Amino acid sequence: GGGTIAMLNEISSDTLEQLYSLAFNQYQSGKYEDAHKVFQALCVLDHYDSRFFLGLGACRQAMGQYDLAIHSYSYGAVMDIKEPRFPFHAAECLLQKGELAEAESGLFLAQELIANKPEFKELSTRVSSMLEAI
Amino acid sequence: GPLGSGGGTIAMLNEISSDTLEQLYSLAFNQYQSGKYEDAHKVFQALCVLDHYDSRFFLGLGACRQAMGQYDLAIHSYSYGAVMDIKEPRFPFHAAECLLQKGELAEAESGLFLAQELIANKPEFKELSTRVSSMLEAIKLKKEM
């Protein structure tokens, strides 16, 4: 039995969570480059945790690296097909690129993935507004 | 950005290099100096996984294990470290230190002779040379007592 690199190497998910807290805080402080390097490491250690690909993609987007962010969100979307944040942040990147039709498609996808789920109240609103602007 | 935006920038964002790991390495190192051995161990262990050819990471992992009294586990890390960098005398020296805790005198002595060979005439290692000679003498005397 082996699924992730961290599991194979007996790195506990508690070590990963401490590294995620560090990366998350670096991101919130505006240290996008430093956070991106911890998120690279976390993505290699556990390539099934959506938060690590959301974070890598958020650092890239913050640095204006829209295509690289979309790559992280494209992997996340195939790895976790019900997670609306992937198509949602991809659409944010596509808007910065001026690709309104593509952005709209992803926003409709995010909407279908959040329907009737109580956890996504705030995001539901964010998505409505954005489509309307478009 | 301080990363710019060319060929090298995109490459840096897509690959793990030693540069990717440097701040995590400084963190683990600082934690070790503060005596936060359990925290430093987590970070060094992740670093060893991310680059299992970097002797610096096995030195730190070994040192944290040694500081926590985990003598067998420290020796695994230090011996692997010596495969990666056979000219680093700290590996055989620290392993010798752990071997003595295990009651393995002959094994500790072989480790100290290698450290001694590695540090001959290196002004950098004058203090370590002094400790090594002291320990070798102590081993011999204990055995002859």
Cβ within 8 Å of A, B 70-109: none
C-beta of residue B53 within 8 angstroms of C-beta of residue B84: yes
Report how far residue A99's alpha carbon sits from residue B46's, in angstroms, rounded to the nearest whole number: 39
Cβ separation A68–B13 shorter than 8 A: yes
Give this entry's resolution in angstroms.
2.0
Give the right CATH number for B1-145 from 1.25.40.10, 2.60.40.1120, 3.40.50.1100, 3.30.70.580: 1.25.40.10
CA angle B41, B43, B44 (to 5 degrees): 65
Q: What are phi and psi of A49, to 5 degrees?
A: -100, 105
Q: How was this structure determined?
A: X-ray
Q: Which of B13, B43, B49 sits opposite A45 (nearest CB)?
A: B49
Cβ separation B46–A45 shorter than 8 A: yes
- Test the A interface: residue of B12, B42, B43 with most A CBs within 10 Å: B42
A17 touches chain B (CB under 8 A): no
Please tell us whether the domain made up of A1-134 is placed in CATH 1.25.40.10: yes
CA distance A126 to chain B (A): 29
Report how far residue B29's alpha carbon sits from residue B61's, in angstroms, rounded to the nearest whole number: 10
Task: Count CB atoms within 10 A of the CB of residue B55.
Answer: 19
